[PDB]
Amino acid sequence: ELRDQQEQVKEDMETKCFICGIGSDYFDTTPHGFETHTLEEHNLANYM
Amino acid sequence: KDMVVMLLSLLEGNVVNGMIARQMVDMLVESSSNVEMILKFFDMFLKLKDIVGSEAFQDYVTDPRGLISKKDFQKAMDSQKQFTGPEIQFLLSCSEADENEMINFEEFANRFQEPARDIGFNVAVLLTNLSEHVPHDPRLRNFLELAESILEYFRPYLGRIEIMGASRRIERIYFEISETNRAQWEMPQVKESKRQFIFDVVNEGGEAEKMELFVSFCEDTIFEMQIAAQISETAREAATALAALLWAVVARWGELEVQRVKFLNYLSRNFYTLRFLALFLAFAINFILLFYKVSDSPPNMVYYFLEESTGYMEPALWCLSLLHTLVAFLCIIGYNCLKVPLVIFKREKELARKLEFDGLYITEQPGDDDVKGQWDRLVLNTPSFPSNYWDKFVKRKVLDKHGDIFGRERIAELLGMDLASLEITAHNETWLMSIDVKYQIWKFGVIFTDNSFLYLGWYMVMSLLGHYNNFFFAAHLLDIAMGVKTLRTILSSVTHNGKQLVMTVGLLAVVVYLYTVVAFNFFRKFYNKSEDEDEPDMKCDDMMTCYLFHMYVGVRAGGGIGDEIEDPAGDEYELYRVVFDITFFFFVIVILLAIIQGLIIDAFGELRDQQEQVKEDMETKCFICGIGSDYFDTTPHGFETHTLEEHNLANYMFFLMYLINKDETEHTGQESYVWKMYQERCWDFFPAGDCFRKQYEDQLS
Amino acid sequence: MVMSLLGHYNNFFFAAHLLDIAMGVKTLRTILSSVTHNGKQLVMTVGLLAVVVYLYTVVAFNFFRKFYNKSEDEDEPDMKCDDMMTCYLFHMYVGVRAGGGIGDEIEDPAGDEYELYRVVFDITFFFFVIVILLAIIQGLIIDAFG
Amino acid sequence: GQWDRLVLNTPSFPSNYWDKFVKRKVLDKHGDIFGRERIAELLGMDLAS
Amino acid sequence: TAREAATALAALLWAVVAR
Ligand SMILES: Nc1ncnc2c1ncn2[C@@H]1O[C@H](COP(=O)(O)OP(=O)(O)OP(=O)(O)O)[C@@H](O)[C@H]1O
Numbered sequence: 001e002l003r004d005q006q007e008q009v010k011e012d013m014e015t016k017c018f019i020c021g022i023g024s025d026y027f028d029t030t031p032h033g034f035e036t037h038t039l040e041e042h043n044l045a046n047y048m
Numbered sequence: 049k050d051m052v053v054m055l056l057s058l059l060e061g062n063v064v065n066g067m068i069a070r071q072m073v074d075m076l077v078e079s080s081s082n083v084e085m086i087l088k089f090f091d092m093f094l095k096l097k098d099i100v101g102s103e104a105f106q107d108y109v110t111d112p113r114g115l116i117s118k119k120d121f122q123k124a125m126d127s128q129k130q131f132t133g134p135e136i137q138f139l140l141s142c143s144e145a146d147e148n149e150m151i152n153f154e155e156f157a158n159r160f161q162e163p164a165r166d167i168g169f170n171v172a173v174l175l176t177n178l179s180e181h182v183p184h185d186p187r188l189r190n191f192l193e194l195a196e197s198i199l200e201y202f203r204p205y206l207g208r209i210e211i212m213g214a215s216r217r218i219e220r221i222y223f224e225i226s227e228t229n230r231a232q233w234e235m236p237q238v239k240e241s242k243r244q245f246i247f248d249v250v251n252e253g254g255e256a257e258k259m260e261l262f263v264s265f266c267e268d269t270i271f272e273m274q275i276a277a278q279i280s281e282t283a284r285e286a287a288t289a290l291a292a293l294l295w296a297v298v299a300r301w302g303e304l305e306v307q308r309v310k311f312l313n314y315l316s317r318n319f320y321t322l323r324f325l326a327l328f329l330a331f332a333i334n335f336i337l338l339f340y341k342v343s344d345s346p347p348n349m350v351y352y353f354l355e356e357s358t359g360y361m362e363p364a365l366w367c368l369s370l371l372h373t374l375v376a377f378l379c380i381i382g383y384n385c386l387k388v389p390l391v392i393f394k395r396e397k398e399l400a401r402k403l404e405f406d407g408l409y410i411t412e413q414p415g416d417d418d419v420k421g422q423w424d425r426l427v428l429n430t431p432s433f434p435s436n437y438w439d440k441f442v443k444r445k446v447l448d449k450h451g452d453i454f455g456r457e458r459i460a461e462l463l464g465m466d467l468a469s470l471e472i473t474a475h476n477e478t479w480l481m482s483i484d485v486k487y488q489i490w491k492f493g494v495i496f497t498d499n500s501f502l503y504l505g506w507y508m509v510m511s512l513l514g515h516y517n518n519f520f521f522a523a524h525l526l527d528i529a530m531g532v533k534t535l536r537t538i539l540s541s542v543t544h545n546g547k548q549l550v551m552t553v554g555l556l557a558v559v560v561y562l563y564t565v566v567a568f569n570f571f572r573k574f575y576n577k578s579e580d581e582d583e584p585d586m587k588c589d590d591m592m593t594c595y596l597f598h599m600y601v602g603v604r605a606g607g608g609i610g611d612e613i614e615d616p617a618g619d620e621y622e623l624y625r626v627v628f629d630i631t632f633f634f635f636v637i638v639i640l641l642a643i644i645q646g647l648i649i650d651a652f653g654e655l656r657d658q659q660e661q662v663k664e665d666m667e668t669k670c671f672i673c674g675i676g677s678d679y680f681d682t683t684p685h686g687f688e689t690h691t692l693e694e695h696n697l698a699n700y701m702f703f704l705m706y707l708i709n710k711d712e713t714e715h716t717g718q719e720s721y722v723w724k725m726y727q728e729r730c731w732d733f734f735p736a737g738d739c740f741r742k743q744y745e746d747q748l749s
Numbered sequence: 750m751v752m753s754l755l756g757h758y759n760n761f762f763f764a765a766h767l768l769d770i771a772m773g774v775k776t777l778r779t780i781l782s783s784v785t786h787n788g789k790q791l792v793m794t795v796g797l798l799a800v801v802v803y804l805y806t807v808v809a810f811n812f813f814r815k816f817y818n819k820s821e822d823e824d825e826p827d828m829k830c831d832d833m834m835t836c837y838l839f840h841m842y843v844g845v846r847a848g849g850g851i852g853d854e855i856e857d858p859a860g861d862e863y864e865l866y867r868v869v870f871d872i873t874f875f876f877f878v879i880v881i882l883l884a885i886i887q888g889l890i891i892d893a894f895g
Numbered sequence: 896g897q898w899d900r901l902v903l904n905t906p907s908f909p910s911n912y913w914d915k916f917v918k919r920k921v922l923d924k925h926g927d928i929f930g931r932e933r934i935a936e937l938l939g940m941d942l943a944s
Numbered sequence: 945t946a947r948e949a950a951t952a953l954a955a956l957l958w959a960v961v962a963r
């Protein structure tokens with residue numbers, strides 16, 4: 001269960017944007033939606 | 049054919065309900081009798097071959113000459129009843145009669161087959177495109193109904209793709225798939241590569257990697273097809289029964305050059321069968337090996353062979369040793385001639401694309417981080433760098449691209465061409481001496497880099513050294529583990545959790561070492577494994593001996609360290625030792641060993657689950673355009689329609705090969721556009737989440 | 750019926766009719782069908798275990814013949830690992846069944862030659878053939894039933 | 896299929912099937928393509944007449 | 945059970961667990 005938790009942390013981080021919640025689903029229709037979204041639109045470091 | 053090509057090029061680019069398509073069908077109606085007559089001609093002369101090839105028509109043949117009379121001709125096509133009476137009369141008028149009222153069925157069928165193939169295909173393409181673009185056309189329904197047999201015959205050769213590249217509008221493109229392409233695609237040699245690629249690309253999961261590796265696999269598959277085309281054309285009884293059962297379950301001066309070529313083709317054709325039979329010989333030699341026995345003196349230890357019918361099997365091992373060695377060497381030659389070109393093509397393509405975009409040497413900073421990237425250096429200077437790759441102008445293209453910035457003369461000496469005079473002469477327009485050394489060093493270096501070739505080389509070393517000691521053929525028994533998929537997964541499960549496994553093994557070693565330290569510091573009195581009181585053997589007075597004994601006994605036994613410990617009854621430290629023994633049991637037997645076992649079995653379970661999930665995801669959604677089956681469960685038998693016609697995976701490689709084959713000036717607008725799009729190495733022509741139905745559901749009907 | 754008629758010839762044969770309980774109950778039917786559900790992987794796993802124990806027995810015959818004495822009496826030293834067939838049978842009968850490696854059966858090392866190599870061989874046999882193969886068989890069967 | 900070939904050319908072929916007229920349907924479907932005599936020999940029927 | 949074997953085992957263990 002612990003190992004599943006560390007795996008789920010990475011899975012949720014990669015399939016969902018932390019800043020705004022939903023992600024990689026509506027953006028997935030646009031090519032490279034999630035990558036651009038997390039690099040420019042909604043990024044954790046840019047808020048700090 | 050030129051007529052219909054012009055017509056369909058005129059129609060190209062139309063919307064679902066456009067004036068062009070409406071006028072198209074209106075004009076087709078305006079010549080209803082004429083187009084119907086043409087379609088009837090095609091239908092009759094196409095069903096002609098089906099009629100003639102049938103056994104029912106063959107039964108009416110009653111002449112050793114092989115020519116059928118006109119009366120029997122009419123009777124046969126009356127029995128078939130496919131052709132109407134006036135149609136049979138017209139066919140009789142068309143008969144190439146030899147003045148004896150006898151007509152050759154074979155010549156009559158074959159003569160009017162080759163010239164009409166292209167035009168029949170084009171007419172079928174036109175009719176299919178009109179039906180697809182404008183479904184609500186009652187007038188076109190009659191023409192489609194008359195175009196029944198022609199469409200069915202030309203359907204396997206026909207293929208449909210739905211790339212979107214113009215004005216963000218999805219459109220359909222049709223082309224001709226030759227019989228040779230599909231026939232060679234049906235070869236299971238490329239089918240296995242298809243399975244491996246469809247596993248690997250889904251395993252990777254990269255968004256752009258999908259299309260990138262798809263195109264890379266298409267290029268590699270085309271190269272493999274080229275290679276294939278160029279190369280084609282008592283206890284003994286129980287032990288014997290067990291071996292048979294195992295085998296059953298597991299199994300289920302120019303003349304010199306001509307001979308060399310024939311030998312290479314022979315080895316390349318049945319390399320896999322050669323490997324299988326080599327495995328069987330390894331089984332046989334190990335089985336024969338299973339009957340040895342040692343003795344004190346020869347018939348000075350002696351390894352002498354003894355069993356019933358020595359003449360059957362003692363020379364058998366002797367001859368099969370050499371036979372296995374020769375078979376394995378032929379296996380090396382076959383592997384060198386078969387698959388090494390494919391990997392060298394992969395590496396050449398990868399380095400060329402890196403040199404073009406990443407510009408590894410125009411920037412001249414490999415960094416020496418990767419040994420492969422460093423070894424990539426020697427081969428640029430060789431003129432024969434791009435020979436294996438289909439393109440050989442990548443060096444000149446990169447020169448023209450980036451020599452204005454980095455200096456043309458700088459990369460003139462780097463990329464291996466003689467000088468700018470070499471390109472000037474190119475624009476102007478013994479075999480031993482033609483061999484370039486550095487290219488060969490790079491070639492065999494990358495050959496010695498690949499894992500499969502080293503596995504086969506280790507096989508060579510073992511087979512050659514097996515004559516030094518016959519027991520060394522037991523190493524060749526590992527092909528079973530390296531063969532069938534289940535044992536390959538079993539072996540890979542060990543390496544899957546390598547980091548975790550080694551770390552927990554280290555943790556177990558740490559725990560046992562700490563327990564050894566405390567056992568020496570407190571309980572050195574109890575470790576008395578000796579029986580005779582005259583010469584006691586204290587198992588724990590030195591660190592190394594005590595630690596070795598712990599690692600050897602405490603973990604292995606399962607009961608704990610106390611099994612070999614003298615019973616602590618009625619003595620000091622009795623409770624301080626019962627605590628130590630119970631915590632040894634609870635921390636070394638029931639947890640850590642269980643942790644390792646669970647790690648191994650869960651790694652294997654995860655590997656099997658991922659293998660099943662690959663096949664599942666194969667069906668949940670189509671990976672070309674990233675569309676699920678939800679839109680097509682709304683209609684009966686829908687996802688099959690998508691896979692077969694809309695975004696079929698097999699038809700894309702046919703489309704690429706068809707683009708390669710025909711010349712540039714014959715490309716249509718869509719074909720030229722997709723050619724340019726691929727040449728730019730930008731992948732947006734793919735549907736990319738947009739199917740035709742998604743755009744045109746309103747008028748799809 | 751055939752077994753029942755055989756039973757009249759010898760009553761002992763009526764014991765084979767007790768297997769009908771398995772087909773009678775759904776749970777027992779699933780229990781027996783677990784073996785044949787994943788029998789493909791199980792057969793090759795058994796083959797792998799046989800291959801591994803064969804490698805270990807040929808290694809033992811090549812280098813460890815003098816540690817395989819099983820006869821307590823010194824008058825008649827019974828060399829269990831005297832021939833390939835006998836040594837392989839002895840391993841496949843005792844080592845896997847014991848569950849604690851072959852060290853329970855082989856005479857323990859007393860600091861003689863090959864002591865380090867002997868302990869490495871014994872520990873790797875224990876690991877590979879106990880913690881890996883038997884555990885995989887157990888997990889495969891229980892996971893198929895689950 | 897090799898074993899079920901044996902039950903084609905015998906009477907009372909649809910003993911348990913609801914439809915006892917499958918022979919006529921198979922005839923009317925495939926006799927034109929495969930010849931009436933061949934279908935008659937295969938299906939075990941006496942004759943088309 | 946000599947110095948060389950223990951040294952090699954400890955070196956391999958440290959090399960693995962260092963990273
Ligand atoms: N708000 C967010 N900030 C950062 N990453 C996010 C965010 N939301 C989603 N992600 C996803 O997490 C990924 C990065 O996560 P993480 O910090 O674990 O990776 P990293 O390996 O440290 O990053 P990188 O190698 O790109 O520097 C992003 O590429 C993106 O897919």
Ligand SMILES: Nc1ncnc2c1ncn2[C@@H]1O[C@H](COP(=O)(O)OP(=O)(O)OP(=O)(O)O)[C@@H](O)[C@H]1O
Pocket residue numbers: 239242243666667669670671672691695696697698
């Ligand atoms: N582009 C695609 N998108 C989604 N599914 C596809 C696509 N192309 C093929 N398929 C799937 O392929 C399946 C056919 O696979 P099948 O069981 O016939 O064997 P295969 O592994 O593809 O090998 P082969 O056809 O070469 O014998 C179809 O049922 C379909 O689901």
Ligand SMILES: Cn1c(=O)c2c(ncn2C)n(C)c1=O
Pocket residue numbers: 266267268270271438439708
């Ligand atoms: C000859 N040829 C190929 O063989 C080829 C290709 N693209 C991929 N391949 C395999 N191109 C553009 C090409 O001209």
Ligand SMILES: Cn1c(=O)c2c(ncn2C)n(C)c1=O
Pocket residue numbers: 913
């Ligand atoms: C009389 N009958 C049947 O007996 C039958 C059937 N479908 C199945 N059976 C058994 N139909 C359609 C039918 O008409």
Ligand SMILES: [Ca+2]
Pocket residue numbers: 712713714715
């Ligand atoms: Ca043109």
Ligand SMILES: [Zn+2]
Pocket residue numbers: 670673675690694695735738739
């Ligand atoms: Zn699609």
